Each structure stands twice: as structure tokens, then as C-alpha cells.
Design a protein around this ligand. Structure first.
Ligand SMILES: O=C(O)CCC(F)(F)C(=O)O
Ligand SMILES: O=C(O)CCC(F)(F)C(=O)O
Lengths: 198, 197
């Protein structure tokens, strides 16, 4: 049962793909790193997500191309692939529960595709916030608080935008009183409202 | 073994999620459908893909929220979910094979995410085209031919764009001779060179 301070790396592009991971607490960011140094987020994982699944494919004989980072402080479990395959026999039920975990991962990615598919960057941002409310939301007076410190830069890397654009967009939303920000945590008021339009 | 003609629906949003599917031949399009009929593609599936995985979470208890369409003529297998659980819990390693297929679905989707992250539509297009080269490509003398009829509208629905914009971009790519198109089949000339970028 391993822990990771916020922003520490769990695995680097190029590392052998030998382990599978289960997220216990916190959020994990998976990203692609381009030669220049720019990261694009491909996933923001919530608690109880299986990940590192490249290792279930070619296993130990192929390398990570994503970077996994503890987006908040993290606790997780991990095992080398050969150990996981075995525990599957000794438990043809664990097997079924993994299948459900991976199915959930698939559905979550598709939902981020929907988010990125919007032409209007504003709606893209609203749609991303809604996913976050679902994944990291905590109920409160004014609606739902996304329980993560979110920099504008981080939002930008997740919705294919730039810091500058995100700042402008978060501000348009605050003016309209549709969200609040305290210590970098976003509160979305009337979330079920916003769900309208898809 | 079932077959579906090109453009036939395999399942509609709101249909109970009762089966899991395995695509043997052809391409299947998963899309989100909006009140007025526009559709957004969330996946173009290639041969040998498990799909319909919502029913592994919930079986027929909940409903589909994506539209599954035969993007080309299609041949597939499908089984109700309890028949699957038995097949698995009764077949230990068949289960390791599913685990792998779902793993592959996850990585394919993440690549569509990388494709959509680009801010420049030209690059979304090229990047989408290169994925299609890997998924449905047939090699030939002038590079790789995407063995799919791809209308401009279908491309637009997959990369978050309008048709007019796709047409223009495809126009650019031909003028620059990075692709040619013949009868909706796109050939990418020197894809490995385009990959770098
Ligand atoms: O397994 C990889 O190497 C990256 C992590 C993942 F993208 F595969 C994931 O499980 O989503
Ligand atoms: O099962 C769904 O409802 C649609 C198809 C799928 F998203 F589930 C899939 O397996 O990608």
C-alpha cells in the first residue's frame, strides 16, 4: 500500500509496463509528454480506478508512453502482472470485478471524448466541470464542490485549451454566478441545471 | 454470428443493456445522439473489439446511452450478460482474454483523446487519419489506404468539426499531396513522416 505526495510520479514514459495499479485515495493524472515538454491530460482518475492497464497487454515487454502523476496526495496498491494473472485463477470472481473496473474506465474515457468534442470552449469547460463534480464532488449549501486544487493550467491541459483562455472562461462563469472559487476549489452552483444542453 | 448491413443500428440509446458484443468483421460506430438528431462519434471500432460494456456494469438493469451503428457491413457475436458470466466463471482464462480486450479499448480511447486535445483542426484531422491508418489501413505503393468509406460528415462527427471545415482541410491535404482520396477512400502518403509532428 504505497503513498505519493502531490505531484510525485507514479510511472514515467519509458518505464517497463510490468505492474497494474488500483487507486485507493486521491486523484491520478495520466498524460502524454511531448518532446518540447508540454503535457496533455488523457485521464483524471478517481478513487477505486484500475490503471496501468498497458501491462495487461504486452505486459513486461513494452514500455509506458504515458506519465502517471499523483494529482493530489495518493494511496494505491500495485502488483506485477504475473501476480495478477495468478490471483485471477485463485479467484474467478476477482476476474469479474476487474472486468467491471475496466468497463467503467472505458465509459469514463468516452465521456471525456464527448467533452472534447464540443466546438465551443465554454461548453467544453462546463462539461469538464460536470464530470469533476461527479467524480470528486462533495455536496454543500451552494451545490457541489469539486474537491481538488485546480490550477487554470491544469484545466487547460485537460480540455485542450490554454491557461489564458481558461482564466477568461472561469471568469465569465463567475460573473454569471455559475461557479465559485475558494482556495482553488471550484463550487458549481445548480449543477443539475447546467447538465441541460448535454 | 449476426450480420448487419452498412448503416444498420446495432443498438439505440435507451435500449436495455443486455448483451456484450464482439466485432468480427467491419467497423462499428459508437456515438452520442442529441435531441435534434446530430450525432457525435465517441469511437470507431475495428475488428476484434469487445463492445457494449455498459452491460458488464449493470446488465439489462440500465439503458444504453450511445448509438451503435454498422459503419461498414458488419459481422459480430453477442451474448446476454449472464451467459457471459458463466462463460467466464466457467472458463478461467477466457476471462484473462476479455481483461486484455478491455485494456485495449481503454488505450484506443485515450488515443482519441490525444487526437481531440489538439487546438489546431488540421492536426486533429491528421492525427485521426493516422489512427485510422493503424486501425483500418491497407498498405500500398503510395502509402496506406484507409479501407473505409469516409464521408466528410463522418470525419466531422469524429473530430469535433463542421463539414465545411473538414472539406477545406481535406482540400489542403490533397493540394499539399499528403493524401489523395478516391471514392471516399483516403490514402495517406508517407504516414510515418506525418507521425513525427
Ligand atoms: O497503462 C499505461 O501505461 C498508462 C495507463 C493507462 F493509460 F493505460 C490506463 O490505465 O488508463
Ligand atoms: O455499452 C454502451 O452502452 C455503449 C457501447 C460501450 F460504450 F459500452 C462500449 O463498449 O464502448
Amino acid at each position: 500500500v504505497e503513498t505519493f505526495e502531490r505531484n510525485k510520479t507514479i510511472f514515467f514514459p519509458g518505464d517497463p509496463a510490468e505492474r497494474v495499479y488500483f487507486l485507493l485515495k486521491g486523484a491520478v493524472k495520466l498524460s502524454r509528454v511531448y518532446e518540447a515538454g508540454e503535457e496533455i491530460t488523457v485521464a483524471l482518475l478517481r478513487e477505486n480506478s484500475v490503471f496501468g492497464v498497458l501491462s495487461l497487454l504486452t505486459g513486461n515487454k513494452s514500455d509506458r508512453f504515458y506519465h502517471a502523476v499523483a494529482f493530489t496526495p495518493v494511496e494505491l496498491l500495485s502488483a506485477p502482472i504475473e501476480q495478477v494473472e495468478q490471483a485471477l485463477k485463485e479467484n474467478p470472481e476477482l476476474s469479474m470485478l476487474m472486468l467491471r473496473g475496466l468497463s467503467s474506465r472505458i465509459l469514463q474515457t468516452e465521456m471525456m471524448i464527448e467533452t472534447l468534442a464540443h466546438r465551443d470552449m465554454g461548453s467544453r469547460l462546463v462539461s469538464f466541470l460536470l464530470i469533476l463534480c461527479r467524480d470528486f464532488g462533495v455536496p454543500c449549501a451552494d451545490g457541489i464542490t469539486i474537491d481538488l486544487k485546480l490550477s487554470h493550467q491544469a484545466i487547460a491541459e485537460a480540455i485542450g485549451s490554454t491557461r489564458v483562455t481558461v482564466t477568461r472562461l472561469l471568469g465569465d462563469l463567475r460573473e454569471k454566478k455559475m461557479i465559485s472559487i475558494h482556495k482553488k476549489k471550484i463550487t458549481v452552483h445548480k449543477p443539475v441545471t447546467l447538465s441541460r444542453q448535454f
